[PDB]
Design a protein around this nucleic acid. Structure first.
Lengths: 346, 346, 346, 346, 346
RNA sequence: UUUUUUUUUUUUUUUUUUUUGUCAUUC
RNA sequence: GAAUGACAAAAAAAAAAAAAAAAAAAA
């Protein structure tokens, strides 16, 4: 019920399943409620779904630390089992349909129905009875805070999305063990690097090399870590000397530049992906680039990736398995030294 | 609840208080429900209220024969008790607020509260206990199918509004006795003429004089009923010889002209009123008048009214009580004969 | 392309696959085009789909005689192969998704992909290569103007929907042979009665008995066709003596009553179905029923059905296979004669 | 008029009363004006009112220092006399109706009519003649910058809302003497505590103890002010060790935690009230609470309140009059020391 | 095509002119695209144009450094040749019509047609063949990064707009030479002062005098630069001692105040102009002025302007040519010293 | 004969936030 | 000596539009 959902929202902040109703009015793609005789906005529809459907999905969203939407997308997850994963980047549900949550978007009441068999259903091991449901599922992805009997685990990212904030949990456990089944057989998830999912204005280093990068000059940092010949002066630090922006394909370099000279980042595809494309215009020098593919790789991980390559190639598209998906980097070695190494996804 | 209201609508045609819910989607001021997997339109909001509130009011509307909205308006009825009167002319509720119907439009749960005391509350005597409520109400209007103990009745119109169509009921009683209370004292309603509330395209005579007017010519009908000197050739039949239309202030004349030559009726104020203003454009002779007051008085009643006037006055405003309200007619006479008789102020 | 679709609409009336572009503006859920410098309406979106998507689907609708949407719904058709069946009752596409029509609603480009296997895909045999496509489909429904080798035909209704109106075509063939496959095995479709799909205001009898019903009185028609004891005075002709309407469960009786005393039909579920529920309000006698199941069976078929039942049962639910689905009728009999006969659950 | 209102807005920033018109276009709940041939947005309607009505109410809003909307709500104010109080928290007018401001919302032209008698009209003493209007009002609330003859004054909050900015006026007087009348008799307003209406990101201490709280550590501040046994470690400072957040019921503690580690405050009821509920999620530790009642009491006032309680009770509901309304706190004590002190029912 | 434009947007962030289409859905004045099965927002329409037309214009906007919209407006530019100048202040195109950009807003395909002759067409000398077009244009404005043969150049502002970022180009050239033609004759543009177009929260001094103003106090800065008798204590620094704000007509003074005490700027006309009007409300002292003309002149330029005036006049209107337009400065003097230099019509 | 897959192979067009040349303009 | 604009040179990859060929596919 719409009124019961709004009552749960106004009394607890989300749908907790309590009983009760409140006066609700829907107008201009917005859900208003009457508090003390005056309308108070509860939810403004930013989705393509009907306003009531989107409101009820938003109320019933998962308020527990859930895997980042990019991780679920890279794993091929098509739907979630008896839960709603809310994509706060899009302000919309991460999946078009649901299983036993919303009557309008329901394709089944339980994940065991035949309709959900071809789909890769996301199972949350922290919910009772979901591990056994995943065991019987033809296609599914399982996350557990611990070990599962009989299946080899895959350790996921240290960070998880808790009500829209990507954090490494201390009071809560945000590191999950990932399992995948395709056509009834358990797949072995490949060894992967994981993007840190940090912000430009809230960037914090997570390693000693990151601290050195943020605190040292370009030449000192390059000489200290023997990073000569890998074009770190352009790939990470950036080249703000031409009308077209040069490099800046790591978020650490973007944060370092933003510390000294604020710029603008036009995100023309506002979604959650491993590689993000930005329309960056440097406010200090005027350097701009229409497409600047940015990956939130750990600086140690990026150093290892770029040092594991073969430098005697004119040009090569390099496949790196990052965030459980194969990211395509365009290696641009010349004369035995790297000229450009940028992600090409999205 | 919205879903319960839609369930009642799709299973019974109106809100009958049955339990159960159906999937509901609200989009573009319209309520849709999923029948066999495809969205089916249930209600398109033509009102100024929120779509869900208007849907709840429309579903909970009175489907029993109810007095016409114009009759309630002329009686000063401001709100209805435990019911919704739907104005089908406006496709909107006849009153802004309700009592014990819709949580967003309710000002009180019962008409006995102090908020409804100054308001003129419409009490329906066919509902159990509403007569007793009307007795204790400071201001109110009561309709009953029969007599009320200790209260003198006022016989209302023979016609009533049954689910949007005006009819003189045969299988169901559509004649009510009107009682009004202002400031706690039972008022004596005046002896009024009643409009027939007919339409042009299905006009049906209700009297012998009406039939004769429909079948007989102008001069024959005027001579037969001794209607010479009352300007019936213009007031009722209408004048189409000039660019500006003349007379045509009775719906009988409009219907007679429509029978031989249809014209266009632009109702620029689509509401329910005793005197209706139309933008009449004659498609045959090109005669048009921007505003034309048309009143649906019975032809016998109009003849009695026009014969009860004093003809020895150049200009006189005639106050005739019609549909429980005073309708002012502007009368022009010359040489002892009527020249012009139309509802004044147009 | 939206502009190419609108170009096809303005130059051919539907998407004919021509090349060209026109200036198109979308505003207030409506598609406008600029003709001679002034915006001209092309399409008003009455669906729940996005305006451009709905416009593209409407332009690519099937303009050939297609089976009525009720027939496809009763056959369990979930999607159409390389075509769009437009439901003119709802002014919306008959199916949520399409196969190789519109990229926004497409789930596959061809009906034989793995995604379309669980779905019952409607194959049109009049299109080259679709019979073989239906032969390879796990679930599908095939209609053909002629015979298909190795498959037993199922003669469908004489009527078909051509651009939104039901007609028995003479210049074009509207009778199709129906073949259904569920889980890869051809099913033998049951012997069924077919609704004639007629309108109230444009009712045209299709048999001698229907003509006699329309012209003869109630008693003469009942005595001529030995229809005593089957309560034809109530089920078909209808009773308007009480405030609650009785009967009117056959559209021919509604047509006969409308021929004399027009009434109002409020379709609170505006969709195509074998059994239609209306909110009937008799404008002459005041009789009204909130819900009334009306089925448009041929009077010969209804007579055969009512004569094939056993009269010596107090209460019995009668199952009739109509329009390829089982319609459940309520049968009440007393003293070896019929009392009421209406579709059950109304 | 709408055009005159827009002229006043574009020439003076608010409706002053000047004569003149500017070209105006209304589209998508927004009012645009044509400045030098290009449309300029004047007002985006965030209310449930019509766009033009909301625009005219916003233009005619009070730009003088007005009482905070929560103060008016706690006093029972239902309408304002010849002025509009704009609620900047909701971006909507604080009251549904107005008195002599907007013709679409007006229930009266002057507050002396019968319709305004039951309502608690807000009279502003800084406008000439409003003191005498309040003296003759059945129900009303009066604010004055000075003393009123024959009336005992109640000193209000030091801060007041000035064009949506809460400030303690230095060049203007933001302290008003509050008077109240119900049924024609003056009440003596209770002696209440007043919330400071401070922001999280712009928190500024208003006393020495708040400075000590923000500067010194938890243990030092607790020991210095003899605050042992009142659970200040969790009640104000808060506990971030478990998955569910504990405490943070004083906005000063939220400000102190924000100063060291920013977190998200999801205000699911964006209105103005003495007690605010937030969906608190700690970005550093992962602690989160769905509903966290936060009140912006002066730290001196909160210390006095917590020291005025009787500690020898297991469970006790505390009635505290804050902002002219009774705020309920739930008190748990064990072994003669406080365990928690939070607003009741959250 | 809408789909091709959206494909270009999702691939490069702006319309580059490539071939390809993506699934696009338009709903609620917003353009969505389907990326990985979920709709992703691409553009939300804040203009008065249709959503598809506005999206096409936004994609085809100029991404190179272009003159500020205020400069073009003051030069009387009515339309741009084969380009779109996006006004990021209004989030709408700076000109109503276009030349060979979008079919819906196009008045001509080339600027040489007769329709574009009366309009002052903006020509970009950086684009090949536009200087020749400007030579043959009856009315036009041309900007070039260098000299033009046979034409005397007018050096423009040092700053220009790059993707909505106003910057002095270092990697790019943001200084242009302005040429204007009206009725086929080349005018000599006047010698003008230029507004710096700086932000309040991102104010950066561009001269030694501005640095001194920001660092020193009022008295020291006035003494060092010999600014006694010019009322710099009010015009620039501003007066907050009264309820009505005094002076503060230079953005440098607003920035200096914002450094120590942030306040509110209600820009009730959100457009780009040389003289901006703000509804300034001082949060610290409560001094507010409904309308306040703030001009972003260089402090040295303003000092020269105020020292070039004739002080021996009681009241005088001062004409200063700023940004190629005549700004009316209202000067008040008493006893041979400046009293107030507020910009006219605040 | 139809179909999806496993795809491979051939050609056309488009593209890639690499370097490099020619023409063009402007210092 | 540079910048910009219009293009080409190198290397790899992607997208489709045309096919052929195949292991499968059901006919």
């Amino acid at each position: 019920s719409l009124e019961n959902v709004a009552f749960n929202v106004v009394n607890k902040g989300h749908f907790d399943g309590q009983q009760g109703e409140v006066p609700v009015s829907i107008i201009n793609n917005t859900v208003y409620t009457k508090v003390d005789g005056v309308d108070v906005e509860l939810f403004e529809n930013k989705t393509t779904l009907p306003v009531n459907v989107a409101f009820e999905l938003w109320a019933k969203r998962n308020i527990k630390p859930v895997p980042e939407v990019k991780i679920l997308n890279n794993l091929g997850v098509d739907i979630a089992a008896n839960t709603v994963i809310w994509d706060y980047k899009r302000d919309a549900p991460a999946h078009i349909s649901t299983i036993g949550v919303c009557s309008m978007t329901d394709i089944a009441k339980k994940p065991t129905e035949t309709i959900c068999a071809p789909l890769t259903v996301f199972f949350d091991g922290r919910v009772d009875g979901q591990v056994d449901l995943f065991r019987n599922a033809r296609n599914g992805v399982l996350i557990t805070e611990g070990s599962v009997k009989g299946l080899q685990p895959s350790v996921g990212p240290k960070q998880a999305s808790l009500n829209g904030v990507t954090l490494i949990g201390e009071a809560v456990k945000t590191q999950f063990n990932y399992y995948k089944k395709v056509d009834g057989v358990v797949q072995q998830l490949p060894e992967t690097y994981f993007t840190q999912s940090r912000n430009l204005q809230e960037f914090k280093p997570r390693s000693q090399m990151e601290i050195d990068f943020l605190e040292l000059a370009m030449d000192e940092f390059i000489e200290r870590y023997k990073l000569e010949g890998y074009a770190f002066e352009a790939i990470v630090y950036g080249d703000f000397s031409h009308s077209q922006l040069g490099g800046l394909h790591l978020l650490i370099g973007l944060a370092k530049r933003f510390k000294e000279s604020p710029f603008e980042l036009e995100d023309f595809i506002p979604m959650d992906s491993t590689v993000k494309n930005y329309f960056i215009t440097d406010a200090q020098t005027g350097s701009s680039k229409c497409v600047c593919s940015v990956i939130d790789l750990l600086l140690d991980d990026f150093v290892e990736i770029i040092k594991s390559q073969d430098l005697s190639v004119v040009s090569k598209v390099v496949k790196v398995t990052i965030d459980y998906t194969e990211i395509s980097f365009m290696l641009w070695c010349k004369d035995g030294h790297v000229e450009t190494f940028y992600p090409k996804l999205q």
